[PDB]
Chains A and B, each alone.
Chain A
C-alpha cells in the first residue's frame, strides 16, 4: 500500500480558514495544528468548542490560540514549555487550556483532511 503516519498537522492555512474547516466538521473538542502565515517560527492551536454561537444549529465556536516557540520548544502565554506540538497538545488533551474569559478548551480528537464516503 503506502507508508505514512498522518497526524494533526495541516500547515498552510489562514485564520478565517481554520474556522470554516472546523465549524464544518461539527465536532466538539476538535483540535487541529496548522502553520501560521509567514509567521516567524510560530504556530496555532485551533479547537472547536462544544459551545454553539447561538443554539442547536449554529457553527460551534473556534478557539484560536497562538503557540509561541522557545528554541524549538513551544508555550502558550505560560512559563512552561513542551518539546513540540505533540508534547504540548497531548498534555493539553488530558488537562485542557484555560481562557482568561473563563472557558476550558478540550481536545478529544484532532481534525483530519480526507473523508472516505462521498
Chain B
C-alpha cells in the first residue's frame, strides 16, 4: 500500500 500518486482535476478548455 503506497501513494501511487494523485488525481488532477481536469479543466474546461481541454476536452
In the bound complex, what is the Cα–Cα distance between A98 and B13 (angstroms)? 8
Chain A interface residue count, Cβ-Cβ cutoff 8 angstroms: 21
Question: What A residues does B12 contact at CB under 8 A?
Answer: 98-100
Q: Is the pair A77, B14 in contact by a Cβ cutoff of 8 Å? A: yes
A66-118 residues at the B interface, CB under 8 angstroms? 66, 76-80, 97-101, 103, 105
In the bound complex, what is the Cα–Cα distance between A16 and B1 (angstroms)? 13
B interface: dominant SS? loop
**Chain A residue at smallest Cβ distance from B8:** A64
- A7 contacts the other chain (CB 8 A): no
Chain B interface residue count, Cβ-Cβ cutoff 8 angstroms: 11
In the bound complex, what is the Cα–Cα distance between A2 and B11 (angstroms)? 41
In the bound complex, what is the Cα–Cα distance between A64 and B9 (angstroms)? 6
Instruction: For the complex formed, measure the closest distance between the CB of A38 and the CB atoms of chain B, giving whole angstroms.
Output: 13
Q: Is the pair B6, A15 in contact by a Cβ cutoff of 8 Å? A: yes
Question: What A residues does B9 contact at CB under 8 A?
Answer: 63-65, 99-101, 103, 105
Instruction: For the complex formed, measure the closest distance between the CB of B5 and the CB atoms of chain A, giving whole angstroms.
Output: 5
The chain B residues found within 8 Å of chain A, CB to CB, are: 3, 5-14
15 of the cross-chain contacts (CB-CB < 8 Å) are A15-B3, A15-B6, A16-B5, A18-B6, A62-B6, A64-B6, A64-B8, A64-B9, A65-B9, A77-B10, A79-B13, A80-B13, A97-B11, A98-B12, A99-B10
